[PDB]
Amino acid sequence: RQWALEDFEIGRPLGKGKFGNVYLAREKQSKFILALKVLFKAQLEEHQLRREVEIQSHLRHPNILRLYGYFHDATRVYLILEYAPLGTVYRELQKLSKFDEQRTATYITELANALSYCHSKRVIHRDIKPENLLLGSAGELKIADFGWSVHAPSSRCGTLDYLPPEMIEGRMHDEKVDLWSLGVLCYEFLVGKPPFEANTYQETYKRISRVEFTFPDFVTEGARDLISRLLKHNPSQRPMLREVLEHPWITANSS
Numbered sequence: 001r002q003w004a005l006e007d008f009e010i011g012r013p014l015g016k017g018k019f020g021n022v023y024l025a026r027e028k029q030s031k032f033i034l035a036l037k038v039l040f041k042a043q044l045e046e047h048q049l050r051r052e053v054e055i056q057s058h059l060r061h062p063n064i065l066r067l068y069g070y071f072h073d074a075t076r077v078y079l080i081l082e083y084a085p086l087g088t089v090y091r092e093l094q095k096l097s098k099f100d101e102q103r104t105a106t107y108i109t110e111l112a113n114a115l116s117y118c119h120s121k122r123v124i125h126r127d128i129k130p131e132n133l134l135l136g137s138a139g140e141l142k143i144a145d146f147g148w149s150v151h152a153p154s155s156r157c158g159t160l161d162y163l164p165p166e167m168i169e170g171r172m173h174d175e176k177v178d179l180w181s182l183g184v185l186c187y188e189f190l191v192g193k194p195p196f197e198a199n200t201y202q203e204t205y206k207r208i209s210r211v212e213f214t215f216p217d218f219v220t221e222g223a224r225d226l227i228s229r230l231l232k233h234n235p236s237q238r239p240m241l242r243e244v245l246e247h248p249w250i251t252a253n254s255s
């Protein structure tokens with residue numbers, strides 16, 4: 001509907017941002033609890049936001065954070081979001097230092113579903129990472145932040161860690177961007193850091209580009225294999241989500 005700031009009691013900040021802020025909040029009439037992202041039209045310098053709104057508003061899936069509405073204020077702008085009671089996968093990762101195969105395989109599965117769904121609408125997220133992954137009340141994973149997403153195919157800096165060769169190289173990309181990230185994520189869940197970390201934007205580039213990762217000895221054949229299949233330079237050689245969900249190692253450990 002037509003919305004407004006005074007429909008809502010603000011509560012705690014949930015995270016900082018250069019574009020704005022996200023508060024805990026409660027719609028006054030329903031006592032409905034949600035996340036309000038409040039943005040600064042001043043810093044913005046329109047383009048993706050229109051997109052991140054159009055796209056998120058039109059997606060409903062349990063593993064994808066809901067967009068309920070927006071409204072601008074004209075010094076500010078507000079997205080009314082689903083609030084995710086258990087925080088980010090990123091804090092969960094930093095708290096527990098690394099994940100068992102079970103947690104990881106499950107997360108990946110949820111992720112696969114949400115992604116498969118997205119591609120089924122020709123939607124590429126392009127920025128799947130822990131800080132954009134959220135936990136519902138059941139501990140269910142929830143893809144968030146459709147800030148960089150677009151229709152496929154597409155063309156296009158910010159951190160390089162979860163982006164694929166085809167994208168950093170400025171080539172043309174499609175839904176397969178997400179498949180490379182699922183692999184980066186898988187790795188990072190198991191290991192505690194992404195397979196191309198480096199101290200330098202420029203070095204991480206060379207790593208991503210030449211596809212250079214090694215595994216800790218503690219990483220099983222089953223995961224090595226999946227991760228290796230996910231992380232192929234030529235996007236066409238990456239498995240469909242359907243195969244991903246099928247993978248022996250996935251099937252052996254998810255829920």
Ligand SMILES: Clc1ccc(CN2CCN(c3c(Br)cnc4[nH]c(-c5ccc(CN6CCOCC6)cc5)nc34)CC2)cc1
Pocket residue numbers: 014015016017018019020021022035037038039081082083084085086087088134144
């Ligand atoms: Cl403008 C802007 C500012 C910050 C951000 C980054 N944040 C974006 C996401 N935010 C949340 C959104 Br949207 C929806 N539901 C949420 N729920 C939480 C959440 C919930 C609980 C916590 C606290 N932890 C709960 C688990 O135990 C340890 C403490 C921290 C965050 N954050 C969000 C918080 C993280 C993005 C954009």
